[PDB]
Amino acid sequence: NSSQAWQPGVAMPNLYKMQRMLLEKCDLQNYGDSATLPKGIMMNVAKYTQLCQYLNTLTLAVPYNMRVIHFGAGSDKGVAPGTAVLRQWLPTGTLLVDSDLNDFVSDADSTLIGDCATVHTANKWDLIISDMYDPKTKNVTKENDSKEGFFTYICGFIQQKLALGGSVAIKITEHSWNADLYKLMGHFAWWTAFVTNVNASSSEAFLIGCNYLGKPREQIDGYVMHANYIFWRNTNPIQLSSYSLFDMSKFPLKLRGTAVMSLKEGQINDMILSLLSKGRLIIRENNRVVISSDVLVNN
Amino acid sequence: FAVDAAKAYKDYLASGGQPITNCVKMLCTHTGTGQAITVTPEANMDQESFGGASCCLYCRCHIDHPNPKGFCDLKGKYVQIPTTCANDPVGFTLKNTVCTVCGMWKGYGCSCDQ
RNA sequence: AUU
Ligand SMILES: Nc1ncnc2c1ncn2[C@@H]1O[C@H](CSCC[C@H](N)C(=O)O)[C@@H](O)[C@H]1O
Ligand SMILES: OC[C@@]1(O)OC[C@@H](O)[C@@H](O)[C@@H]1O
Ligand SMILES: OC[C@H]1O[C@H](O)[C@H](O)[C@@H](O)[C@@H]1O
Ligand SMILES: OC[C@H]1O[C@H](O)[C@H](O)[C@@H](O)[C@@H]1O
Ligand SMILES: [Cl-]
Ligand SMILES: [Mg+2]
Ligand SMILES: [Mg+2]
Ligand SMILES: [Zn+2]
Ligand SMILES: [Zn+2]
């Protein structure tokens, strides 16, 4: 019955981002509650649908021949529900690559199996989606500190392989988070922590960076920002809702035909930064897309 | 010698076997063209749309596709399954044929005969 | 986190 129940989810309000909270234990009023989904619909089809519905409200750059990479695309079901939703959402012809530590069946153009740290790409990407989560995160035996592992790889991959004007959606939870990733959110024209309405009973959120600038527009302390995120979640219970899943008439990402140009670092003036910040420009080469996974050889 | 997965699955279903689970059902308007295999969900009011790879016996069993180049006609696309048969999408795509003229399933949409 |  809450107004936010008809939305795909809830974004962290600006005043919560401006606080200096100390990290506390996350204690959601509805922790673990299950959502009633449309008949036969998987949780991750519902969750990725709500993420895409929210991304539709932002200034995403959508060039012709868009390039999208999806990390953590596998599942205990052996299929890739999130990849299927991204394939539905993205313009026909969009190149979609997905990856996971474990083998799985995918609708992506190409799938790389192995630790994400083994994944190398010669090309830059327009959109990076990560749903990676380390199962060992469930073994909480000490203070909740910034996590490394795949987050270290994701921070480096964003800084080296995301096109200027590009965007990211990186999944975090109370214990699955990284301070450097929050700091990098300050290198985008805008950012938020987005909670889907179908999984509002979880500390899960997608850290969304919209329109990459390749330089810090604001200085973010990641430890403080995660504490701010948990404070927001602890004081703002969100009602589980699948209301947005029933109207798919405006679901597909609009093909904007965003300009793609190759500019050297030094030609990025305030006029170029303004176009990047408005989702009207992608800066990267347009060479053939080549990917690989490093294989360790042993007896 | 070559393994006949298609025949093995059909024989399994005839013996009372549980259909392959975890076919990925998509959210859609149900106001689509109703064609069998499409670039995006095209379910009409009498169908469900599924991610193609999750409904392919060869993709799901991790076995070679039955054709020289081993090409998959479902991976990366969406398959429309009649709502009355949506409990076994893998079996439906395996036992049915697409009309090369209208793109509808023969016996479940194709009206070229009339 | 894969309800
Ligand atoms: N270092 C790493 N490299 C690659 N994948 C990783 C990883 N750490 C965790 N993952 C993957 O993260 C995934 C979390 S479950 C992901 C669910 C999936 N997005 C869906 O649509 O249903 C797991 O498959 C796990 O193998
Ligand atoms: O594969 C068919 C199906 O109905 O089997 C049971 C569940 O796994 C559903 O998600 C799936 O679509
Ligand atoms: O790739 C999927 C697999 O890895 C994940 O980390 C999960 O912990 C496991 O349940 C799943 O089977
Ligand atoms: O089951 C709890 C809730 O979950 C679902 O997401 C529905 O939107 C809502 O009608 C229901 O009350
Ligand atoms: Cl925006
Ligand atoms: Mg499960
Ligand atoms: Mg949940
Ligand atoms: Zn296949
Ligand atoms: Zn026909």
Tab-separated table of C-alpha atoms (C1' of nucleotides) and ligand atoms in Angstrom:
chain	number	residue	atom	x	y	z
A	1	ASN	CA	0.000	0.000	0.000
A	2	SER	CA	3.142	2.256	0.225
A	3	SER	CA	3.722	4.566	-2.835
A	4	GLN	CA	7.127	2.934	-3.423
A	5	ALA	CA	5.310	-0.460	-3.812
A	6	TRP	CA	4.345	0.339	-7.477
A	7	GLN	CA	8.008	1.196	-8.352
A	8	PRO	CA	10.545	-1.537	-9.348
A	9	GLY	CA	12.446	-0.795	-6.102
A	10	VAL	CA	13.906	1.929	-3.874
A	11	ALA	CA	17.115	3.976	-4.359
A	12	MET	CA	19.139	5.242	-1.343
A	13	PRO	CA	17.915	8.831	-0.694
A	14	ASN	CA	20.443	11.701	-1.048
A	15	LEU	CA	20.341	12.760	2.646
A	16	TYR	CA	21.418	9.219	3.719
A	17	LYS	CA	24.454	9.457	1.390
A	18	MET	CA	25.512	12.718	3.149
A	19	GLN	CA	25.727	11.218	6.681
A	20	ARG	CA	28.841	9.953	8.564
A	21	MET	CA	27.410	6.841	10.249
A	22	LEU	CA	29.472	4.141	12.024
A	23	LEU	CA	28.876	0.599	10.664
A	24	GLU	CA	26.206	-1.321	12.623
A	25	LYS	CA	24.748	-4.827	12.259
A	26	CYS	CA	21.977	-4.909	9.614
A	27	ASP	CA	18.625	-5.787	11.285
A	28	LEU	CA	15.783	-5.698	8.712
A	29	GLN	CA	12.246	-5.774	10.178
A	30	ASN	CA	11.199	-8.265	7.402
A	31	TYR	CA	14.577	-10.090	7.038
A	32	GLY	CA	14.298	-13.260	4.898
A	33	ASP	CA	10.556	-12.821	4.081
A	34	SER	CA	9.611	-14.425	0.717
A	35	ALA	CA	7.869	-12.458	-2.060
A	36	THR	CA	4.834	-13.888	-3.921
A	37	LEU	CA	5.946	-13.790	-7.584
A	38	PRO	CA	3.835	-14.241	-10.743
A	39	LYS	CA	3.166	-17.985	-11.294
A	40	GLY	CA	6.275	-19.911	-12.510
A	41	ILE	CA	8.616	-16.843	-12.389
A	42	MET	CA	12.080	-17.348	-10.811
A	43	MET	CA	13.345	-14.884	-8.147
A	44	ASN	CA	16.230	-13.754	-10.414
A	45	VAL	CA	13.956	-13.195	-13.436
A	46	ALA	CA	11.858	-10.941	-11.138
A	47	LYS	CA	14.947	-9.263	-9.584
A	48	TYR	CA	16.768	-8.550	-12.898
A	49	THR	CA	13.477	-7.345	-14.429
A	50	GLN	CA	13.161	-4.787	-11.577
A	51	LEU	CA	16.864	-3.766	-11.933
A	52	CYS	CA	16.356	-3.190	-15.712
A	53	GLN	CA	13.066	-1.298	-15.065
A	54	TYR	CA	15.041	1.012	-12.722
A	55	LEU	CA	17.969	1.396	-15.185
A	56	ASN	CA	15.321	2.526	-17.771
A	57	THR	CA	14.754	5.674	-15.596
A	58	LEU	CA	18.480	6.713	-15.756
A	59	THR	CA	20.553	8.438	-18.500
A	60	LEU	CA	22.206	5.202	-19.755
A	61	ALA	CA	24.222	5.599	-22.981
A	62	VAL	CA	22.795	3.123	-25.563
A	63	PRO	CA	24.964	3.167	-28.706
A	64	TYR	CA	24.425	1.012	-31.800
A	65	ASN	CA	26.326	-2.321	-31.350
A	66	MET	CA	26.309	-1.857	-27.554
A	67	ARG	CA	28.701	-4.085	-25.515
A	68	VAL	CA	27.567	-5.568	-22.182
A	69	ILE	CA	29.429	-7.945	-19.846
A	70	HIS	CA	27.662	-9.883	-17.033
A	71	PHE	CA	29.766	-11.364	-14.175
A	72	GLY	CA	28.310	-13.958	-11.762
A	73	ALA	CA	25.769	-15.089	-14.408
A	74	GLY	CA	25.674	-18.789	-13.362
A	75	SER	CA	23.460	-20.286	-10.636
A	76	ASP	CA	22.755	-23.451	-8.587
A	77	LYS	CA	20.063	-24.165	-11.247
A	78	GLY	CA	22.745	-24.536	-14.007
A	79	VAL	CA	20.991	-21.812	-16.120
A	80	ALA	CA	21.357	-17.970	-16.328
A	81	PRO	CA	18.023	-16.254	-15.517
A	82	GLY	CA	19.688	-12.818	-15.244
A	83	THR	CA	21.388	-13.211	-18.650
A	84	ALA	CA	17.978	-14.152	-20.176
A	85	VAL	CA	16.459	-10.910	-18.760
A	86	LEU	CA	19.425	-8.766	-19.938
A	87	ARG	CA	19.069	-10.348	-23.456
A	88	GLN	CA	15.327	-9.425	-23.402
A	89	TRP	CA	16.009	-5.847	-22.169
A	90	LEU	CA	18.965	-4.873	-24.415
A	91	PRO	CA	18.473	-3.790	-28.049
A	92	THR	CA	18.566	-6.680	-30.565
A	93	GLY	CA	22.166	-7.192	-31.772
A	94	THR	CA	23.716	-5.956	-28.491
A	95	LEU	CA	26.851	-8.046	-27.788
A	96	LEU	CA	26.341	-9.782	-24.408
A	97	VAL	CA	29.161	-11.732	-22.740
A	98	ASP	CA	28.630	-13.528	-19.439
A	99	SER	CA	30.883	-15.315	-16.976
A	100	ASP	CA	30.941	-17.440	-13.802
A	101	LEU	CA	33.363	-19.579	-11.749
A	102	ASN	CA	31.117	-22.622	-12.517
A	103	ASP	CA	29.807	-23.990	-15.847
A	104	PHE	CA	26.197	-23.037	-16.764
A	105	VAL	CA	23.831	-22.845	-19.805
A	106	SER	CA	23.540	-19.283	-21.223
A	107	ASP	CA	21.742	-17.148	-23.874
A	108	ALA	CA	24.805	-14.830	-24.045
A	109	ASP	CA	26.779	-14.409	-27.317
A	110	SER	CA	29.850	-15.815	-25.475
A	111	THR	CA	30.359	-17.340	-21.981
A	112	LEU	CA	33.707	-17.514	-20.077
A	113	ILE	CA	33.987	-20.110	-17.264
A	114	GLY	CA	36.568	-19.479	-14.526
A	115	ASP	CA	37.468	-17.085	-11.698
A	116	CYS	CA	36.688	-13.533	-12.917
A	117	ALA	CA	40.374	-12.668	-12.184
A	118	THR	CA	41.271	-14.898	-15.213
A	119	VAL	CA	39.013	-12.901	-17.608
A	120	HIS	CA	40.826	-10.548	-20.038
A	121	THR	CA	39.225	-8.367	-22.749
A	122	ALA	CA	41.062	-6.267	-25.355
A	123	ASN	CA	37.921	-4.053	-25.727
A	124	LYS	CA	36.008	-1.589	-23.479
A	125	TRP	CA	32.365	-2.147	-22.414
A	126	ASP	CA	29.283	0.137	-22.300
A	127	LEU	CA	27.622	-1.643	-19.335
A	128	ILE	CA	29.015	-3.966	-16.615
A	129	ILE	CA	26.584	-6.041	-14.494
A	130	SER	CA	27.869	-8.133	-11.556
A	131	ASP	CA	25.817	-10.508	-9.372
A	132	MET	CA	28.934	-12.228	-7.943
A	133	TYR	CA	28.798	-13.280	-4.246
A	134	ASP	CA	31.454	-15.414	-2.465
A	135	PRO	CA	29.687	-18.258	-0.565
A	136	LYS	CA	32.344	-17.907	2.208
A	137	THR	CA	30.801	-14.463	3.000
A	138	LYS	CA	28.094	-16.424	4.940
A	139	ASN	CA	30.811	-17.560	7.425
A	140	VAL	CA	30.876	-14.332	9.557
A	141	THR	CA	33.587	-14.926	12.220
A	142	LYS	CA	34.956	-11.365	12.729
A	143	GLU	CA	34.245	-7.626	12.270
A	144	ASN	CA	32.497	-6.801	8.933
A	145	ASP	CA	35.437	-5.288	6.961
A	146	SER	CA	35.829	-4.372	3.249
A	147	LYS	CA	36.067	-7.568	1.146
A	148	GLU	CA	38.682	-8.171	-1.582
A	149	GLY	CA	38.458	-11.217	-3.910
A	150	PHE	CA	36.298	-10.457	-6.985
A	151	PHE	CA	35.720	-6.843	-5.801
A	152	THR	CA	39.437	-6.104	-6.387
A	153	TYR	CA	39.041	-7.387	-9.965
A	154	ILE	CA	35.791	-5.407	-10.537
A	155	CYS	CA	37.385	-2.086	-9.405
A	156	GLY	CA	40.319	-2.645	-11.799
A	157	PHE	CA	38.023	-3.818	-14.642
A	158	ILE	CA	35.839	-0.663	-14.320
A	159	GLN	CA	38.915	1.645	-14.359
A	160	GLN	CA	40.570	-0.171	-17.315
A	161	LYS	CA	37.698	-1.576	-19.429
A	162	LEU	CA	34.599	0.630	-18.940
A	163	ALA	CA	34.019	3.182	-21.737
A	164	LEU	CA	33.640	6.799	-20.584
A	165	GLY	CA	29.844	7.389	-20.495
A	166	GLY	CA	29.355	3.703	-19.581
A	167	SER	CA	27.468	2.441	-16.514
A	168	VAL	CA	27.657	-0.374	-13.934
A	169	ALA	CA	25.307	-2.292	-11.586
A	170	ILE	CA	27.366	-4.248	-8.983
A	171	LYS	CA	25.586	-6.389	-6.383
A	172	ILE	CA	26.537	-5.880	-2.703
A	173	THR	CA	25.059	-7.097	0.622
A	174	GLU	CA	25.681	-6.212	4.291
A	175	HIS	CA	28.816	-8.446	4.328
A	176	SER	CA	29.607	-8.616	0.554
A	177	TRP	CA	30.994	-5.114	-0.098
A	178	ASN	CA	34.204	-3.213	-0.897
A	179	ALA	CA	35.246	0.325	0.181
A	180	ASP	CA	37.162	1.014	-3.096
A	181	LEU	CA	33.976	0.192	-5.114
A	182	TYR	CA	31.981	2.851	-3.202
A	183	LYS	CA	34.907	5.286	-3.751
A	184	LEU	CA	34.743	4.576	-7.555
A	185	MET	CA	30.996	5.420	-7.535
A	186	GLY	CA	32.309	9.021	-7.165
A	187	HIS	CA	33.906	8.676	-10.664
A	188	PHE	CA	30.410	8.595	-12.315
A	189	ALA	CA	28.068	11.517	-13.085
A	190	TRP	CA	25.617	9.953	-10.605
A	191	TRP	CA	25.368	6.850	-8.394
A	192	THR	CA	23.027	5.077	-6.012
A	193	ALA	CA	22.390	1.873	-4.054
A	194	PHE	CA	19.197	0.283	-5.493
A	195	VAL	CA	17.065	-2.294	-3.627
A	196	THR	CA	14.630	-4.383	-5.684
A	197	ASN	CA	11.068	-4.527	-4.313
A	198	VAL	CA	10.930	-8.353	-4.802
A	199	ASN	CA	14.020	-8.905	-2.574
A	200	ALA	CA	13.536	-5.950	-0.149
A	201	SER	CA	13.809	-8.477	2.785
A	202	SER	CA	17.544	-8.836	1.904
A	203	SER	CA	20.480	-6.445	2.618
A	204	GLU	CA	21.248	-6.934	-1.111
A	205	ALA	CA	21.512	-3.796	-3.263
A	206	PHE	CA	22.927	-2.952	-6.663
A	207	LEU	CA	25.553	-0.187	-6.561
A	208	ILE	CA	24.762	1.702	-9.766
A	209	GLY	CA	27.306	4.039	-11.374
A	210	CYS	CA	25.665	6.065	-14.171
A	211	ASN	CA	27.901	7.670	-16.912
A	212	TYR	CA	31.587	6.967	-16.133
A	213	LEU	CA	33.814	10.117	-16.144
A	214	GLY	CA	37.189	8.339	-15.572
A	215	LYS	CA	38.020	10.835	-12.768
A	216	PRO	CA	36.551	11.601	-9.318
A	217	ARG	CA	33.723	14.197	-9.381
A	218	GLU	CA	33.290	13.685	-5.585
A	219	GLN	CA	35.446	12.048	-2.856
A	220	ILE	CA	33.573	9.103	-1.268
A	221	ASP	CA	34.885	7.290	1.857
A	222	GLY	CA	33.707	3.686	1.191
A	223	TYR	CA	33.687	2.628	4.873
A	224	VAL	CA	31.445	5.611	5.745
A	225	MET	CA	29.198	5.103	2.665
A	226	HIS	CA	28.567	1.384	3.464
A	227	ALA	CA	27.707	2.404	7.080
A	228	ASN	CA	25.324	5.041	5.601
A	229	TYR	CA	23.762	2.319	3.375
A	230	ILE	CA	23.163	-0.038	6.357
A	231	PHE	CA	21.742	2.871	8.432
A	232	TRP	CA	19.285	3.644	5.589
A	233	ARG	CA	18.240	-0.065	5.357
A	234	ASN	CA	17.912	-0.411	9.191
A	235	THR	CA	15.621	2.650	9.513
A	236	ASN	CA	13.585	2.284	6.277
A	237	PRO	CA	11.726	-1.038	6.046
A	238	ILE	CA	10.689	-1.760	2.431
A	239	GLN	CA	7.437	-3.709	1.754
A	240	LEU	CA	7.979	-6.707	-0.585
A	241	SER	CA	6.297	-5.940	-3.934
A	242	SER	CA	6.024	-7.585	-7.379
A	243	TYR	CA	3.572	-4.908	-8.666
A	244	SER	CA	6.025	-3.609	-11.351
A	245	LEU	CA	6.465	-7.114	-12.920
A	246	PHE	CA	2.885	-7.107	-14.279
A	247	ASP	CA	3.343	-4.229	-16.801
A	248	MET	CA	6.127	-5.070	-19.302
A	249	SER	CA	4.802	-2.753	-22.089
A	250	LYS	CA	7.719	-0.239	-21.664
A	251	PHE	CA	10.411	-2.743	-20.601
A	252	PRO	CA	12.884	-2.757	-23.555
A	253	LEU	CA	15.857	-0.377	-23.233
A	254	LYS	CA	15.278	2.478	-25.751
A	255	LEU	CA	17.860	2.504	-28.588
A	256	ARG	CA	19.211	6.091	-28.248
A	257	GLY	CA	21.874	5.549	-30.965
A	258	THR	CA	24.358	7.281	-28.593
A	259	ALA	CA	27.472	8.571	-30.417
A	260	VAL	CA	30.691	6.513	-29.955
A	261	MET	CA	34.034	8.310	-30.498
A	262	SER	CA	37.715	7.614	-29.688
A	263	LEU	CA	39.327	10.572	-27.812
A	264	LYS	CA	42.837	10.557	-26.232
A	265	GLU	CA	43.135	11.496	-22.503
A	266	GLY	CA	43.639	15.293	-22.873
A	267	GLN	CA	40.822	15.926	-25.411
A	268	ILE	CA	38.242	15.198	-22.628
A	269	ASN	CA	37.293	18.887	-21.983
A	270	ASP	CA	34.375	20.249	-19.839
A	271	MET	CA	32.166	20.162	-23.010
A	272	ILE	CA	32.910	16.396	-23.473
A	273	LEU	CA	32.365	15.756	-19.699
A	274	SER	CA	28.939	17.481	-20.012
A	275	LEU	CA	27.918	15.125	-22.902
A	276	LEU	CA	29.207	12.074	-20.933
A	277	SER	CA	27.293	13.236	-17.804
A	278	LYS	CA	24.000	13.419	-19.807
A	279	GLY	CA	24.265	9.919	-21.374
A	280	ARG	CA	24.856	11.446	-24.864
A	281	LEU	CA	28.383	10.079	-25.500
A	282	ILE	CA	30.451	6.858	-25.237
A	283	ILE	CA	34.274	7.176	-25.505
A	284	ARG	CA	36.097	4.009	-26.637
A	285	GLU	CA	37.562	2.355	-29.758
A	286	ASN	CA	35.097	0.273	-31.837
A	287	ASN	CA	37.517	-2.626	-32.615
A	288	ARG	CA	36.414	-6.300	-32.777
A	289	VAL	CA	35.425	-7.736	-29.336
A	290	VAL	CA	38.032	-10.308	-28.179
A	291	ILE	CA	37.850	-12.029	-24.751
A	292	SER	CA	39.797	-14.804	-23.025
A	293	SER	CA	40.081	-16.775	-19.766
A	294	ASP	CA	43.555	-17.650	-18.398
A	295	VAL	CA	43.935	-21.430	-17.822
A	296	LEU	CA	46.371	-22.668	-15.110
A	297	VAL	CA	48.084	-25.870	-16.383
A	298	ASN	CA	48.942	-28.649	-13.826
A	299	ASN	CA	49.616	-32.446	-13.665
B	1	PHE	CA	27.978	-45.112	-32.611
B	2	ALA	CA	26.284	-41.878	-31.394
B	3	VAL	CA	24.123	-41.210	-28.258
B	4	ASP	CA	20.440	-40.509	-29.146
B	5	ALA	CA	19.517	-38.027	-26.354
B	6	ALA	CA	16.212	-37.018	-28.061
B	7	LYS	CA	14.925	-40.643	-28.091
B	8	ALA	CA	16.260	-41.209	-24.532
B	9	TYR	CA	14.322	-38.163	-23.184
B	10	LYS	CA	11.083	-39.125	-25.058
B	11	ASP	CA	11.385	-42.712	-23.634
B	12	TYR	CA	12.068	-41.236	-20.129
B	13	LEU	CA	8.867	-39.081	-20.317
B	14	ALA	CA	6.808	-42.091	-21.550
B	15	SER	CA	8.062	-44.078	-18.473
B	16	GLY	CA	6.685	-41.398	-16.061
B	17	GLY	CA	9.927	-39.366	-15.752
B	18	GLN	CA	9.748	-35.807	-14.312
B	19	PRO	CA	10.216	-33.159	-17.075
B	20	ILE	CA	13.512	-31.152	-17.084
B	21	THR	CA	13.057	-28.280	-14.579
B	22	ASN	CA	14.492	-24.723	-14.397
B	23	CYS	CA	13.467	-23.678	-17.938
B	24	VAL	CA	13.682	-19.833	-17.588
B	25	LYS	CA	10.189	-18.332	-17.960
B	26	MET	CA	10.220	-14.636	-18.952
B	27	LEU	CA	7.911	-11.789	-17.874
B	28	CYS	CA	6.164	-10.346	-20.974
B	29	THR	CA	2.939	-8.624	-22.162
B	30	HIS	CA	1.376	-11.831	-23.649
B	31	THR	CA	0.343	-9.571	-26.625
B	32	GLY	CA	3.171	-10.865	-28.920
B	33	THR	CA	3.119	-12.414	-32.442
B	34	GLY	CA	2.890	-16.007	-31.105
B	35	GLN	CA	5.741	-17.209	-33.399
B	36	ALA	CA	7.711	-20.250	-32.085
B	37	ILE	CA	11.350	-18.938	-31.806
B	38	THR	CA	11.974	-15.157	-31.697
B	39	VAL	CA	14.719	-12.582	-30.878
B	40	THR	CA	12.562	-11.320	-27.938
B	41	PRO	CA	9.579	-12.774	-25.975
B	42	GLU	CA	6.572	-12.986	-28.357
B	43	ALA	CA	4.099	-15.034	-26.256
B	44	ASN	CA	0.436	-14.383	-27.115
B	45	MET	CA	-2.401	-14.845	-24.548
B	46	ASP	CA	-2.209	-18.684	-25.080
B	47	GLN	CA	1.562	-19.026	-24.494
B	48	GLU	CA	4.535	-18.576	-22.109
B	49	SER	CA	7.960	-17.291	-23.328
B	50	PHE	CA	11.182	-18.983	-22.138
B	51	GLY	CA	14.910	-18.286	-22.527
B	52	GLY	CA	15.879	-20.558	-25.461
B	53	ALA	CA	19.098	-22.148	-24.122
B	54	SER	CA	17.285	-23.346	-20.932
B	55	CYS	CA	14.728	-25.205	-23.173
B	56	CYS	CA	17.356	-26.936	-25.397
B	57	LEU	CA	17.926	-30.643	-24.512
B	58	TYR	CA	21.487	-30.495	-25.994
B	59	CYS	CA	22.432	-27.268	-24.137
B	60	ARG	CA	20.922	-28.594	-20.823
B	61	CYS	CA	22.498	-32.126	-21.027
B	62	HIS	CA	25.890	-30.696	-22.208
B	63	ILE	CA	25.909	-32.846	-25.393
B	64	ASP	CA	26.658	-32.075	-29.088
B	65	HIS	CA	23.782	-30.563	-31.166
B	66	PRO	CA	22.564	-33.037	-33.854
B	67	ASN	CA	23.872	-31.325	-37.063
B	68	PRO	CA	27.294	-31.000	-38.815
B	69	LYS	CA	28.249	-27.511	-37.416
B	70	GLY	CA	26.575	-28.265	-34.026
B	71	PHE	CA	24.494	-25.041	-34.290
B	72	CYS	CA	21.732	-24.334	-31.692
B	73	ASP	CA	18.460	-22.771	-32.990
B	74	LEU	CA	17.280	-21.876	-29.400
B	75	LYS	CA	20.355	-20.381	-27.614
B	76	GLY	CA	20.158	-16.540	-27.496
B	77	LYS	CA	16.488	-16.540	-28.581
B	78	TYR	CA	13.084	-16.977	-26.854
B	79	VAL	CA	10.809	-19.987	-27.386
B	80	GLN	CA	6.994	-19.624	-27.119
B	81	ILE	CA	5.351	-22.714	-25.513
B	82	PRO	CA	1.545	-23.222	-25.348
B	83	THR	CA	0.447	-22.563	-21.722
B	84	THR	CA	-1.104	-26.102	-21.610
B	85	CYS	CA	2.374	-27.611	-22.416
B	86	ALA	CA	4.565	-25.151	-20.393
B	87	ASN	CA	5.262	-27.882	-17.758
B	88	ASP	CA	7.824	-29.452	-20.204
B	89	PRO	CA	9.329	-26.864	-22.620
B	90	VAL	CA	12.333	-29.133	-23.482
B	91	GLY	CA	9.950	-31.952	-24.510
B	92	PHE	CA	7.737	-29.555	-26.503
B	93	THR	CA	10.629	-28.100	-28.614
B	94	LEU	CA	11.994	-31.672	-29.104
B	95	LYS	CA	8.631	-33.200	-30.278
B	96	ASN	CA	7.360	-30.239	-32.403
B	97	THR	CA	8.345	-28.500	-35.687
B	98	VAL	CA	8.283	-24.783	-36.699
B	99	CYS	CA	6.479	-23.773	-39.954
B	100	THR	CA	9.174	-22.391	-42.343
B	101	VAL	CA	6.436	-20.106	-43.846
B	102	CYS	CA	4.551	-18.390	-40.926
B	103	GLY	CA	7.094	-19.160	-38.124
B	104	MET	CA	4.324	-20.664	-35.913
B	105	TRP	CA	4.451	-24.182	-34.360
B	106	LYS	CA	2.770	-26.783	-36.599
B	107	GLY	CA	-0.442	-27.800	-34.739
B	108	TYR	CA	-0.190	-24.835	-32.307
B	109	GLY	CA	-0.597	-21.645	-34.409
B	110	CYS	CA	0.311	-22.490	-38.045
B	111	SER	CA	-2.883	-22.114	-40.172
B	112	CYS	CA	-1.114	-22.493	-43.590
B	113	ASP	CA	-3.049	-25.767	-44.269
B	114	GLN	CA	-6.389	-23.825	-44.212
C	1	A	C1'	23.769	-14.104	-2.884
C	2	U	C1'	21.283	-18.435	-6.477
C	3	U	C1'	13.224	-16.616	-2.375
D	1	LIG	N1	35.557	-14.891	-8.089
D	1	LIG	C1	34.472	-15.191	-8.796
D	1	LIG	N2	34.585	-15.279	-10.139
D	1	LIG	C2	33.509	-15.630	-10.846
D	1	LIG	N3	32.277	-15.905	-10.425
D	1	LIG	C3	32.194	-15.815	-9.093
D	1	LIG	C4	33.216	-15.479	-8.228
D	1	LIG	N4	32.758	-15.485	-6.916
D	1	LIG	C5	31.503	-15.849	-7.014
D	1	LIG	N5	31.086	-16.029	-8.311
D	1	LIG	C6	29.774	-16.475	-8.757
D	1	LIG	O1	28.772	-15.602	-8.291
D	1	LIG	C7	27.517	-16.297	-8.483
D	1	LIG	C8	26.499	-15.836	-7.473
D	1	LIG	S1	24.890	-16.603	-7.795
D	1	LIG	C9	24.405	-15.649	-9.265
D	1	LIG	C10	22.976	-15.824	-9.748
D	1	LIG	C11	22.799	-15.382	-11.207
D	1	LIG	N6	23.155	-13.957	-11.372
D	1	LIG	C12	21.354	-15.583	-11.672
D	1	LIG	O2	20.936	-14.873	-12.609
D	1	LIG	O3	20.614	-16.420	-11.155
D	1	LIG	C13	27.847	-17.787	-8.375
D	1	LIG	O4	27.463	-18.502	-9.542
D	1	LIG	C14	29.365	-17.817	-8.171
D	1	LIG	O5	29.982	-18.915	-8.803
D	2	LIG	O1	11.352	-26.304	-16.670
D	2	LIG	C1	9.949	-26.153	-16.509
D	2	LIG	C2	9.603	-25.587	-15.138
D	2	LIG	O2	8.222	-25.324	-15.078
D	2	LIG	O3	9.977	-26.584	-14.183
D	2	LIG	C3	9.713	-26.215	-12.818
D	2	LIG	C4	10.421	-24.930	-12.422
D	2	LIG	O4	11.832	-25.160	-12.389
D	2	LIG	C5	10.089	-23.825	-13.412
D	2	LIG	O5	10.852	-22.649	-13.125
D	2	LIG	C6	10.373	-24.291	-14.835
D	2	LIG	O6	9.998	-23.289	-15.771
D	3	LIG	O1	27.757	-21.147	-9.876
D	3	LIG	C1	26.682	-21.566	-9.027
D	3	LIG	C2	27.185	-22.209	-7.730
D	3	LIG	O2	28.100	-21.354	-7.013
D	3	LIG	C3	27.577	-20.442	-6.042
D	3	LIG	O3	28.662	-19.795	-5.373
D	3	LIG	C4	26.667	-21.086	-4.996
D	3	LIG	O4	27.219	-21.067	-3.667
D	3	LIG	C5	26.274	-22.509	-5.377
D	3	LIG	O5	25.090	-22.867	-4.652
D	3	LIG	C6	26.000	-22.637	-6.868
D	3	LIG	O6	25.693	-24.006	-7.170
D	4	LIG	O1	3.966	-12.311	-0.210
D	4	LIG	C1	4.265	-10.961	0.174
D	4	LIG	C2	4.052	-10.025	-1.016
D	4	LIG	O2	4.889	-10.489	-2.067
D	4	LIG	C3	4.585	-10.175	-3.439
D	4	LIG	O3	5.768	-9.608	-4.017
D	4	LIG	C4	3.329	-9.336	-3.775
D	4	LIG	O4	3.626	-8.137	-4.503
D	4	LIG	C5	2.442	-8.971	-2.594
D	4	LIG	O5	1.103	-8.950	-3.111
D	4	LIG	C6	2.594	-9.971	-1.455
D	4	LIG	O6	1.782	-9.581	-0.343
D	5	CL	CL	20.661	9.352	-14.292
D	6	MG	MG	16.984	-21.858	-4.786
D	7	MG	MG	15.598	-12.980	-0.644
D	8	ZN	ZN	21.230	-25.830	-27.618
D	9	ZN	ZN	2.449	-21.875	-41.329
